Design an enzyme around this catalytic site. Sequence first.
Site, PDB file in Angstrom:
ATOM      1  N   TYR A 131      26.602  35.306  27.005  1.00 19.77           N
ATOM      2  CA  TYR A 131      27.983  35.450  27.799  1.00 19.77           C
ATOM      3  C   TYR A 131      29.076  34.816  26.689  1.00 19.77           C
ATOM      4  O   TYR A 131      30.361  35.234  26.773  1.00 19.77           O
ATOM      5  CB  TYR A 131      28.137  34.775  28.972  1.00 19.77           C
ATOM      6  CG  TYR A 131      27.820  35.727  30.137  1.00 19.77           C
ATOM      7  CD1 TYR A 131      28.367  36.281  30.908  1.00 19.77           C
ATOM      8  CD2 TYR A 131      26.382  35.736  30.252  1.00 19.77           C
ATOM      9  CE1 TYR A 131      27.835  37.526  31.934  1.00 19.77           C
ATOM     10  CE2 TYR A 131      25.752  36.915  31.053  1.00 19.77           C
ATOM     11  CZ  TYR A 131      26.280  37.426  32.093  1.00 19.77           C
ATOM     12  OH  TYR A 131      25.939  38.119  32.884  1.00 19.77           O
ATOM     13  N   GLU A 174      28.386  31.762  45.432  1.00 24.79           N
ATOM     14  CA  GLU A 174      29.224  32.670  46.121  1.00 24.79           C
ATOM     15  C   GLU A 174      28.900  32.525  47.630  1.00 24.79           C
ATOM     16  O   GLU A 174      30.025  32.742  48.509  1.00 24.79           O
ATOM     17  CB  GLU A 174      29.212  34.050  45.701  1.00 24.79           C
ATOM     18  CG  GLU A 174      30.204  34.988  46.466  1.00 24.79           C
ATOM     19  CD  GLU A 174      30.044  36.516  45.724  1.00 24.79           C
ATOM     20  OE1 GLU A 174      29.298  37.489  46.216  1.00 24.79           O
ATOM     21  OE2 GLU A 174      31.067  36.726  44.796  1.00 24.79           O
ATOM     22  N   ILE A 202      27.676  30.932  28.669  1.00 25.83           N
ATOM     23  CA  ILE A 202      26.453  30.359  28.428  1.00 25.83           C
ATOM     24  C   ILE A 202      25.476  31.454  27.868  1.00 25.83           C
ATOM     25  O   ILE A 202      25.526  32.841  28.313  1.00 25.83           O
ATOM     26  CB  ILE A 202      25.862  29.434  29.861  1.00 25.83           C
ATOM     27  CG1 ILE A 202      26.346  28.106  29.945  1.00 25.83           C
ATOM     28  CG2 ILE A 202      24.272  29.566  29.454  1.00 25.83           C
ATOM     29  CD1 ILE A 202      27.248  27.788  28.770  1.00 25.83           C
ATOM     30  N   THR A 223      28.240  40.653  52.848  1.00 23.07           N
ATOM     31  CA  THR A 223      26.946  39.900  52.465  1.00 23.07           C
ATOM     32  C   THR A 223      26.897  38.457  52.372  1.00 23.07           C
ATOM     33  O   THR A 223      26.425  37.612  51.376  1.00 23.07           O
ATOM     34  CB  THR A 223      26.557  40.492  51.008  1.00 23.07           C
ATOM     35  OG1 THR A 223      27.561  40.258  49.934  1.00 23.07           O
ATOM     36  CG2 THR A 223      26.625  42.191  51.199  1.00 23.07           C
ATOM     37  N   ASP A 239      37.151  46.210  39.629  1.00 25.40           N
ATOM     38  CA  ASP A 239      36.090  46.788  38.514  1.00 25.40           C
ATOM     39  C   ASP A 239      36.895  48.125  38.524  1.00 25.40           C
ATOM     40  O   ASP A 239      36.281  49.020  39.573  1.00 25.40           O
ATOM     41  CB  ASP A 239      34.817  46.574  39.058  1.00 25.40           C
ATOM     42  CG  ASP A 239      33.891  46.924  37.944  1.00 25.40           C
ATOM     43  OD1 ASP A 239      34.198  48.147  37.278  1.00 25.40           O
ATOM     44  OD2 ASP A 239      32.934  46.473  38.089  1.00 25.40           O
ATOM     45  N   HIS A 278      36.911  39.646  47.505  1.00 26.12           N
ATOM     46  CA  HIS A 278      36.023  40.707  46.699  1.00 26.12           C
ATOM     47  C   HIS A 278      36.362  42.100  46.766  1.00 26.12           C
ATOM     48  O   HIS A 278      36.734  42.652  47.946  1.00 26.12           O
ATOM     49  CB  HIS A 278      34.642  40.321  47.118  1.00 26.12           C
ATOM     50  CG  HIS A 278      33.408  40.870  46.375  1.00 26.12           C
ATOM     51  ND1 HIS A 278      33.162  42.047  46.280  1.00 26.12           N
ATOM     52  CD2 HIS A 278      32.364  40.087  45.996  1.00 26.12           C
ATOM     53  CE1 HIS A 278      32.241  42.088  45.517  1.00 26.12           C
ATOM     54  NE2 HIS A 278      31.636  41.130  45.296  1.00 26.12           N
ATOM     55  N   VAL A 335      33.774  34.787  33.079  1.00 32.59           N
ATOM     56  CA  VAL A 335      34.091  34.940  31.726  1.00 32.59           C
ATOM     57  C   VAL A 335      33.967  36.746  31.207  1.00 32.59           C
ATOM     58  O   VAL A 335      34.534  36.886  30.209  1.00 32.59           O
ATOM     59  CB  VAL A 335      33.403  34.413  30.688  1.00 32.59           C
ATOM     60  CG1 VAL A 335      31.901  34.788  30.532  1.00 32.59           C
ATOM     61  CG2 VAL A 335      33.970  34.353  29.316  1.00 32.59           C
TER      62      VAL A 335
END
EC number: 2.4.1.40
Lengths: 272, 272
Positions: free
Chosen positions: A65, A230, A62, A172, A253, A160, A139
């Site tokens: 992105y 999440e 959207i 978290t 990452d 995560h 995405v």
Amino acid sequence: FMVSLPRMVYPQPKVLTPCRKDVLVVTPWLAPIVWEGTFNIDILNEQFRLQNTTIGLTVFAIKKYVAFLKLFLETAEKHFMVGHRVHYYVFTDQPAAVPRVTLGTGRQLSVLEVRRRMEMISCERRFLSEVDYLVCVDVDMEFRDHVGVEILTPLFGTLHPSFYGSSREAFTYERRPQSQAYIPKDEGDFYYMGGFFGGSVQEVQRLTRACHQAMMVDQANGIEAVWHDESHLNKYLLRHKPTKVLSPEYLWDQQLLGWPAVLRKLRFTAVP
Amino acid sequence: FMVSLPRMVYPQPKVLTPCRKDVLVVTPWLAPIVWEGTFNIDILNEQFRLQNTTIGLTVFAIKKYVAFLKLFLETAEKHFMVGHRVHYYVFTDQPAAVPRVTLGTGRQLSVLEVRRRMEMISCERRFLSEVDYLVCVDVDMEFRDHVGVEILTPLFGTLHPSFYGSSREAFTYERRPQSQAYIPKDEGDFYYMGGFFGGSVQEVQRLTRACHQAMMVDQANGIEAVWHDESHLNKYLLRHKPTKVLSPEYLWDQQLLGWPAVLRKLRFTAVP
Ligand SMILES: O=c1ccn([C@@H]2O[C@H](COP(=O)(O)OP(=O)(O)O)[C@@H](O)[C@H]2O)c(=O)[nH]1
Ligand SMILES: O=c1ccn([C@@H]2O[C@H](COP(=O)(O)OP(=O)(O)O)[C@@H](O)[C@H]2O)c(=O)[nH]1
Ligand SMILES: OC[C@H]1O[C@@H](O)[C@H](O)[C@@H](O)[C@H]1O
Ligand SMILES: OC[C@H]1O[C@@H](O)[C@H](O)[C@@H](O)[C@H]1O
């Protein structure tokens, strides 16, 4: 009904030699935690092709992105479920901005215009008719290495990458009791990433329906969970244990976290 | 449909600490291998009680083997699926020799007269109506410790206690190509014990039907597999991978094999 596997020649598993000694490879509710060295993909591939498995992959692109779709799809063609039937579902506000990506045989792409994700996923009838499993991802990512049928199971979440070595109090989770997503400090198995979950279509529709209903409760009560869908996905997975857990190989990452030795492969990664 | 688990307080699983480093806890097709330290039975118990699980346990006691039923059943009452609904099916040529054993609540026993096991198991309609899982065991045994819902899965086999450290060439599979049970020297995952297998009713009926058909082929061809139904069960499990594997905790012989350190518990054992 599952037909017999053909004869296969492969290394004998040895009971008194573990695959991986460095990491937990099964949860306390007996779900496999999927790391490199735990699976023989040839066996798995045979199992899932004998069932003529179709995997649906959902992605939302959207506004800005849509720029991520080219690399996302091109890399998915190199690494995601290769050899299997794949249906991509691209949800977007800009159908004309979807790049034209060349697909391998047995792979299709549908563009679905939209005017949030949990609602939109829970398409129910379509998915039940067209795919066996649903995989639901962010995405703004790329495939770097194999992501295949080893992930498939009735319900999965992904560790995560910022929290797989953390204690539960550091997770978290939503901590306000006024939210449907609330998890006390002394509860929790793992902190799952909202950007990679999946399962059978039935189980994914159960999860997304439940999360969407919980988000609507919170909205009516004037509360927005700390990490949005999440946080709700975390609540759901605490109360409905996943039947596999994917290691952080599957959502990494490299810029933020590097390439630690415990990660033998970096399979699906954030784009810089 | 599976309702939510209630809140529970238990130790956090930690990804960077394995439960067991000394043994393989997941197969290469991502089935858990069930050892002590791999499961939280409180979680499992909750999962299976929320489904109101009923377990059927089949045992054959023909001729002199009726002498084993008292200790088998009494010890099953102490250790097998306690808290769950249990239906024992005792197959015998001597209904009047079945001992009168006092059962806990929610547990029943049926005596089925017979005039082999694979045929007799594949009772099909009855089992589908009365139990969710079937567990099929030898009678000349006793429960010494917990055997519970951690074993339950669509299809399971048990590691034979004489072969869990062996190389596949040492396994006593049927090696004659003229038998339906044949397995070449370069094939095989494990050597499963014929005295402890199980699964969902559907999967157990598939297995026993297939083995009975393969045994009838062999009979017609004038060949009897080296280890009888156990050879056929091995063939089946090679070609239809089990969704859990039980460690030799679950089928042991202390007189023959002692109490090795890798066995934290001796759960179901041969009687001297
Ligand atoms: O303007 C937006 C914001 C979010 N998303 C979709 O929502 C996902 C989750 O948001 P994002 O990836 O930004 O979350 P992050 O990983 O930055 O915390 C995005 O990957 C897209 O897949 C989108 O399409 N457009
Ligand atoms: O005369 C017999 C022989 C066998 N069995 C049943 O068949 C099982 C398998 O045989 P057995 O236990 O003798 O095999 P083993 O463990 O000695 O190799 C027995 O446990 C009983 O459960 C029986 O009931 N009566
Ligand atoms: O603490 C949770 C957060 O962790 C970040 O690293 C991630 O970018 C967020 O999307 C959210 O998952
Ligand atoms: O080699 C296979 C055999 O091993 C023995 O120890 C057992 O008593 C037999 O029933 C059979 O399983």
